[PDB]
């Protein structure tokens, strides 16, 4: 499978793209971003189209596509 490219947007409206494959557990994405923002992953909620992204959600389960957006808010 190919990597798809998602855009993760933070509270400050800054921008980080992540590449994942369609069956990758998005907790790996959460961890990396939380680590890059210098905050505990559990202090954050990651939303796809307003819907909460579970640790074991995959882009396939959520119906994600290239250039889809993940929004990060405070928990």
């Amino acid at each position: 499978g190919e990597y798809i490219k998602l855009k993760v947007i933070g509270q400050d409206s800054s921008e980080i793209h992540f590449k994942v494959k369609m069956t990758t557990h998005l907790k790996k994405l959460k961890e990396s971003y939380a680590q890059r923002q210098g905050v505990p992953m559990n202090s954050l909620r990651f939303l796809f189209e307003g819907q909460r992204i579970a640790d074991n959600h995959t882009p396939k389960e959520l119906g994600m596509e290239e250039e889809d957006v993940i929004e990060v808010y405070q928990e």
Binding site: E2, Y3, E15, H17, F18, K19, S32, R36
Partner: peptide, 15 residues
């Protein structure tokens, strides 16, 4: 701000 692309397993890759 520069473009940032992180690969969750080279950021140009698609496989």
């Amino acid at each position: 701000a520069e473009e940032r692309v992180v690969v969750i397993s080279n950021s140009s890759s698609r496989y």
